[PDB]
């Protein structure tokens, strides 16, 4: 609807290929590909992508608005990239990177190693901070969710892996 | 006079190939059970098998509507006391996909010795190929 | 997770959402308010 009516402007240096329902968006940061729902009609009006309900479908504007914000995110991913920052709160908690294997040390009896996916690159500025970058927004949010999932932050001290921007509602242990 | 009956020695039967890609399960199966019974022939006789041999291929690509791909359940019982078993539709396609067409048609044929003889003419295949080129089967469109 | 027959908004931050055929109350503020109709 209101999201889908607003067209997505392709910048310069961003190659867009429409192919049925398959759309490959290239750029200086990589290529991204997504098969759309069959309820979505996509067409390139020479500087913008537009998004209309294909006929004979119930959720016309609902599927189109999903198809808008994805290809909006595919454009921003191939010209800027996404960057999700994580920090580690807790004594002795740290992280190290070996190419694409983040080596977490989260107070377990066993080492924690996380294999990174394909288009995702990570970096630790500090031992208690993880910064990971990449193109696809769904994937960097997934990797950030996986690294958060090892130590979901305790409400009594905020201890554990958190997002660098989120708020952690704490709790006092009463007596 | 008396009403004609078909005779099992003089009856002739034919061969058909049906492609089951994308077709609805029950709407395919009722046309197979119509043609295995022999109710498309004017010389139909209830106590005589007058139907046609039918080869069904691409049995793993049959389609069902709704949520029945994950919610239609095929129960059976092994005879032993805990022996209730259970498989969903998409597990049956992965495990042994020929049974799905076979179970649907077997429920639509008559029950008895003749209905089991009608089921022997249904020859289903998961793949896109068959060893029955020697019988010269025609392409049946359903 | 409260599981009830009657699920209701308990504060201003409750949001009634239907996830997979189940009416669910989720609250960003209070974890006591999260509900599930069952």
């Amino acid at each position: 609807s209101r999201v889908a009516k607003a067209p997505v402007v392709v910048p310069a240096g961003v190659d867009v290929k429409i192919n049925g329902q398959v759309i490959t968006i290239k750029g200086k940061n990589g290529e991204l590909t997504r098969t759309l729902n069959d309820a979505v009609e996509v067409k390139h009006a020479d500087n913008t992508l537009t998004f209309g309900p294909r006929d004979g479908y119930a959720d016309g504007w609902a599927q189109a608005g999903t198809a808008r914000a994805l290809l909006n995110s595919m454009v921003i991913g191939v010209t800027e990239g996404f960057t999700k920052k994580l920090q580690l709160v807790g004594v002795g908690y740290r992280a190290a990177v070996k190419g694409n294997v983040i080596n977490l040390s989260l107070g377990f009896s066993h080492p924690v190693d996380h294999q990174l996916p394909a288009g995702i690159t990570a970096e630790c500025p500090t031992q208690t901070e993880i910064v990971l970058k990449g193109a696809d927004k769904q994937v960097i949010g997934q990797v950030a969710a996986d690294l958060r999932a090892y130590r979901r932050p305790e409400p009594y001290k905020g201890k554990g892996v958190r997002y660098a921007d989120e708020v952690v509602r704490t709790k006092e242990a009463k007596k | 006079m008396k009403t004609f009956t078909a005779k099992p020695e003089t009856v002739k039967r034919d061969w058909y190939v049906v492609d089951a890609t994308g077709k609805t399960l029950g709407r395919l199966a009722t046309e197979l059970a119509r043609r295995l019974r022999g109710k498309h022939k004017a010389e139909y006789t209830p106590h005589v098998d007058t139907g046609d041999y039918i080869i069904v291929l691409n049995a793993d690509k049959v389609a069902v509507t709704g949520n029945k791909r994950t919610d239609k359940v095929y129960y059976h019982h092994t005879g032993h006391i805990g022996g209730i078993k259970q498989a969903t539709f998409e597990e049956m396609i992965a495990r042994r996909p020929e049974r799905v067409i076979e179970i649907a048609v077997k429920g639509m044929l008559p029950k008895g010795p003749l209905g089991r003889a009608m089921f022997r003419k249904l020859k289903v295949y998961a793949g896109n190929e068959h060893n029955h080129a020697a019988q010269q089967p025609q392409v049946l469109d359903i | 997770m409260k599981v009830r027959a009657s699920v209701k908004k308990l504060c201003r931050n409750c949001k009634i959402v239907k996830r997979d055929g189940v009416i669910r109350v989720i609250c960003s503020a209070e974890p006591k308010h999260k509900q599930r109709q069952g």
Binding site: - | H80, I81, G83 | -
Partner: protein, 209 residues
């Protein structure tokens, strides 16, 4: 990995230096020689067919003796078959020695157990005997009740009752191999394998590791 066909020689013990007595089962393993190599193009699966021992020449039948003559090998006392893993192959007339188990550590020994004959439910299914006194009328080792009243006019399938015990294929898993003596064709596994003395055994490397 394939296994080998041996024979239960008997049991003995290996005194270690440390003062530990290991109860071992001597399994002589003669040279298993392959008789047929099975593959995907002809047979649908990958396996080999081996033979061991000797057999009286007047007793091996013409269908059976022709099967050894195609492989070109002496007739053995039986024919067994071992499924092949991938990347593992054998020729037809190849002989396989007990040095195959030189570097395994646990094996599974499959044999036919001893025949207990028609056994009652005290012996077979470990039922409790009833009371040997206090009034018991002719019912000291009987199975007792076997069902319920009218709800299931019937005894269920697989009800534990009397019948044949033993004389059947059983497999003891994860037996520690003690010694592999290639010179006199032996194989010492820790513990007791199924079968009587002199019966055929199938020794395979342990699948549960």
């Amino acid at each position: 990995m394939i296994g080998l066909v041996g024979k239960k020689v008997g049991m003995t013990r290996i005194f270690t230096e440390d003062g530990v007595s290991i109860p071992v089962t001597v399994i002589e393993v003669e040279a298993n020689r392959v008789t047929q190599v099975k593959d995907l193009a002809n047979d649908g699966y990958r396996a080999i067919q081996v033979t061991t021992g000797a057999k009286k020449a007047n007793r091996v039948t013409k269908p059976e003796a022709g099967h050894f003559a195609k492989a070109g090998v002496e007739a053995g006392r039986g024919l067994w078959e071992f499924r092949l893993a991938e990347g593992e192959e054998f020729t037809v007339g190849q002989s396989i020695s007990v040095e195959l188990f030189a570097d395994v550590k646990k094996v599974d020994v499959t044999g036919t157990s001893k025949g207990k004959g028609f056994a009652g439910t005290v012996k077979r299914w470990n039922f409790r005997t009833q009371d040997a006194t206090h009034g018991n009328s002719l019912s000291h080792r009987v199975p007792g009740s076997i069902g319920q009243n009218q709800t299931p006019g019937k005894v269920f399938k697989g009800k534990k009752m009397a019948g044949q015990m033993g004389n059947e294929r059983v497999t003891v898993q994860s037996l520690d191999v003690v010694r592999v003596d290639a010179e006199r064709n032996l194989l010492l596994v820790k513990g007791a394998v199924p079968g009587a003395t002199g019966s055929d055994l199938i020794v395979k490397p342990a699948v549960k590791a």
